[PDB]
């Protein structure tokens with residue numbers, strides 16, 4: 001109920017081995033049923049208003065939520081969470097139809113919170129988990145190799161502290177672009193230095209809201225490629241345990257699930273977007289991802 | 303009070319006639335009520351009643367709509383305010399007839415005199431007449447923007463391609479305002495020039511319709527007149543004023559289905575904005591749709607806003623008709639008075 | 642340098658013979674040099690000489706300015722780059738003649754074929770002939786902006802009052818672009834629509850001169866052509882060309898102080914671009930903010946400095962050349 005699992009299939013770029021029916025909420029390659037399904041034609045704005053938008057209402061209530069993008073490389077994970085700029089500087093990013101979830105989300109927050117007329121405060125942070133180590137993508141001064149320290153939080157027994165993690169204040173929607181642009185530059189230095197790692201790292205973006213005093217928080221997680229590990233294995237199980245309420249959820253077995261435990265249980269909503277390729281050679285992988293999403297929340301066909 | 307919600311019922315069409323539909327809708331102008339028979343061909347007893355600021359039954363004349371709804375607003379606009387009038391409701395119920403109106407067949411009338419002329423031509427004629435009459439020094443600009451499938455188009459630019467999309471930006475001076483880059487505001491010097499500007503706009507609109515799927519029922523249309531006035535009196539006050547009036551013909555309320563889905567969203571947003579402004583709620587979600595964002599500077603601030611909600615009499619429309627009246631009633635909730 | 646500076650001296654005309662004047666200016670096209678007799682019998686031997694990228698003397702035809710200046714630039718625009726060509730100099734030294742040109746007496750020719758046409762008409766014709774020949778799909782927009790007393794006006798809007806001022810803003814989509822709220826950009830589908838559009842603009846320019854005194858000598862004129870070109874992977878390339886007829890270089894005295902300001906900072910900006918200074922003061926005038934899109938980048942920029950040969954004009958003439966040399970400093974040959 002509070003954990004939605006949706007699939008989105010991307011456009012190619014001819015042999016189509018998949019198929020998706022939105023009304024019957026089914027993906028056929030072999031057939032699975034989900035909370036929602038998006039076919040190749042599907043558009044960034046659609047994904048946003050169906051999956052993300054309801055979750056952000058909750059976040060604005062003072063809840064803490066998380067949205068994952070899961071899948072292999074080439075399926076639209078970075079496309080879905082981040083997006084691209086349309087050609088010829090035709091659009092502002094707030095209007096760009098090719099803008100992914102993170103931009104739409106930050107735009108939406110300033111739209112909704114400005115409409116409300118109340119004093120509010122916005123904060124973002126972005127961290128990468130690579131080989132069970134945590135790195136801060138928004139700290140301007142730190143070298144790209146500095147690991148962060150995290151430990152359990154004496155005040156919060158759902159929580160941890162990530163020590164020194166930069167929380168950047170976004171004063172207005174405009175400033176958001178500079179912030180994440182530097183982050184992208186840093187992250188491009190980290191990938192060069194360490195083992196061509198963009199497919200191997202987990203991105204945790206976090207926006208936190210202070211409404212003057214209720215606090216919402218949303219974490220937008222772009223996981224490392226699901227093709228073949230541990231952080232992926234552990235999350236399935238944390239998800240499995242949260243679906244059925246089998247006690248002692250194994251949060252402690254990965255950095256990801258420890259960092260997230262606070263949101264992953266509490267009064268919350270959690271979604272994961274499983275991304276798949278239509279193309280011929282991806283087939284083993286598509287099946288893993290649907291199986292994985294199937295394992296996550298098990299929904300029998302109709 | 304500055305927000306008025308009214309309903310206008312049209313007569314039957316041929317289709318409802320040939321189709322043996324029966325009238326389910328009753329209008330009582332004096333009590334400002336609309337009743338609908340909700341019980342189909344089985345029950346004649348079931349009725350739902352709504353009350354609004356005014357109700358125009360099927361015999362209502364264009365001029366009647368103009369005098370009650372528009373003139374009080376036009377007075378305000380000439381005084382230097384910025385106001386808005388919407389036509390809301392199901393495709394084929396009269397939004398265009400109301401806003402634009404129609405030529406009387408067999409020639410006869412000038413458009414200035416034609417009893418079938420709607421709000422837009424009557425409004426423009428009166429602007430020129432009223433200001434020419436008090437000796438105001440003034441100028442008039444008109445623009446027409448279509449919001450279609452999430453995109454912006456300009457119908458009064460005669461040179462540009464119907465496929466040309468326009469971009470929206472914040473207005474740096476004003477948090478309530480936007481700028482639509484390249485939207486033409488055409489200066490019209492008299493009532494003839496506005497006839498020819500709109501005659502061309504209609505042709506360009508037909509062209510666009512032919513090009514794009516379900517075009518009139520799927521677009522919002524924003525017609526805007528801006529008036530710059532300077533009133534000068536020897537040995538007296540010199541007043542400068544800027545009036546603005548938006549006449550908005552909304553997309554069909556009946557409801558790709560993502561296209562039909564997205565229309566439905568901006569409609570609900572508009573509804574929420576109106577509800578909030580009647581209620582004086584602090585959260586007015588202006589920024590949740592293009593339409594409401596574009597109209598925010600009119601709707602915010604000191605104005606008059608009216609909605610004309612149009613419906614069919616026919617039984618074959620029951621669901622849509624009820625949905626429309628629920629929408630109107632949700633925008634401004636007036637309590638039924640005892641019978 | 643993709644900044645080309647050239648100089649054009651027009652012929653000694655009737656009135657200057659009626660003024661019984663003396664031609665003081667000499668152009669070496671081959672040496673690319675201009676020299677002026679500076680002394681008026683004070684020496685009368687005395688000479689100033691300047692070197693440039695090209696120099697066009699009194700006998701230069703319109704087609705020669707087009708070939709050497711405009712063509713290379715057009716080519717770059719059609720590749721998708723923004724460029725700017727300026728005419729700079731004293732009033733009645735030939736800027737309008739150069740940018741616009743004149744109709745041939747008679748009815749001898751059509752403007753398309755008229756040997757007296759200036760840069761603007763030759764440029765539009767060529768854009769239409771070239772992209773049509775190219776066979777791919779394209780569209781052409783034009784706008785004409787006047788900057789008079791640091792206010793913006795739209796000369797191509799038929800309907801609007803010649804006194805309506807426009808407001809400008811940064812374009813949030815890019816660093817160098819601006820938005821001039823309400824500036825019309827008229828789509829032109831063929832060469833014939835161009836003539837109509839510019840003729841209406843001429844009247845509106847004429848009626849606006851009748852109002853605000855000075856004008857064409859006191860205002861900057863910015864003419865922009867924007868071309869959208871479709872390719873195939875399917876792509877749009879976008880070129881833009883600005884043709885800028887600057888306010889007179891000579892110099893109420895208030896606008897005069899200010900015209901000089903922009904012209905001055907325009908100079909500052911050009912120098913900054915030729916010899917690279919870290920911060921180019923684009924923002925220090927309306928004109929340079931507006932031209933910023935076409936100055937930064939891979940761009941061919943060109944300035945055509947116009948001058949009179951006559952003695953009556955010495956002072957102005959030397960400033961102009963000095964202005965041009967200051968903007969890009971080259972060195973004399975043997």
Ligand SMILES: Cc1ccc(C(=O)N(CCCN)[C@@H](c2nc3cc(Cl)ccc3c(=O)n2Cc2ccccc2)C(C)C)cc1
Nearest residue numbers: 081082083084085093096099102103177180181183184187
């Ligand atoms: C509309 C749009 C979409 C994407 C971009 C873009 O390519 N990037 C760079 C990386 C995208 N793969 C933007 C971007 N960068 C990110 C960097 C990191 Cl480390 C994490 C997330 C993002 C991200 O979401 N974006 C997209 C974006 C665009 C505008 C505003 C916020 C976010 C930045 C120029 C701001 C630009 C404009």
Ligand SMILES: Cc1ccc(C(=O)N(CCCN)[C@@H](c2nc3cc(Cl)ccc3c(=O)n2Cc2ccccc2)C(C)C)cc1
Nearest residue numbers: 402403404405413416419422423457497500501503504507
């Ligand atoms: C008395 C009368 C009423 C309607 C018309 C009419 O049919 N049209 C075309 C649209 C029909 N739906 C007129 C008209 N066209 C418009 C085009 C656009 Cl894009 C937007 C609004 C209008 C519009 O309001 N009208 C009505 C009108 C009539 C006379 C003067 C001004 C406007 C034009 C001939 C001027 C003609 C005369």
Ligand SMILES: Cc1ccc(C(=O)N(CCCN)[C@@H](c2nc3cc(Cl)ccc3c(=O)n2Cc2ccccc2)C(C)C)cc1
Nearest residue numbers: 740741742743744752755758761762836839840842843846
């Ligand atoms: C071959 C030719 C050259 C000049 C003209 C001419 O005199 N004008 C008027 C302005 C003269 N200074 C033409 C013209 N007008 C302009 C008006 C403005 Cl506001 C800005 C530029 C021009 C301009 O460049 N021209 C020349 C021209 C001629 C034909 C086609 C395009 C441009 C118009 C009849 C089209 C006519 C024919």
Ligand SMILES: Nc1ncnc2c1ncn2[C@@H]1O[C@H](COP(=O)(O)OP(=O)(O)O)[C@@H](O)[C@H]1O
Nearest residue numbers: 009010011042072073074075076077078079080
């Ligand atoms: N829904 C979609 N619509 C259009 N293109 C898509 C979609 N999903 C993915 N793509 C394409 O995927 C490419 C980017 O792949 P990306 O998502 O960056 O890989 P990864 O998930 O490994 O980071 C882009 O060329 C983009 O066009």
Ligand SMILES: Nc1ncnc2c1ncn2[C@@H]1O[C@H](COP(=O)(O)OP(=O)(O)O)[C@@H](O)[C@H]1O
Nearest residue numbers: 311312313392393394395396397398399400404
């Ligand atoms: N109140 C009315 N009186 C007479 N004719 C009307 C009335 N309302 C609508 N019509 C006619 O009914 C048809 C549909 O109305 P129209 O306003 O054009 O549709 P829409 O609501 O889709 O814009 C048109 O022929 C119009 O002329």
Ligand SMILES: Nc1ncnc2c1ncn2[C@@H]1O[C@H](COP(=O)(O)OP(=O)(O)O)[C@@H](O)[C@H]1O
Nearest residue numbers: 650651652701731732733734735736737738739
């Ligand atoms: N290169 C030239 N060849 C022939 N005539 C010229 C030349 N340059 C200028 N003229 C003449 O000088 C006159 C006045 O200068 P003009 O062209 O109006 O420039 P400005 O706008 O600076 O006055 C024009 O009518 C034109 O005939």
Ligand SMILES: [Cl-]
Nearest residue numbers: 483484822823
């Ligand atoms: Cl604009």
Ligand SMILES: [Cl-]
Nearest residue numbers: 753766770832
């Ligand atoms: Cl030709």
Ligand SMILES: [Mg+2]
Nearest residue numbers: 397398518551
């Ligand atoms: Mg309509």
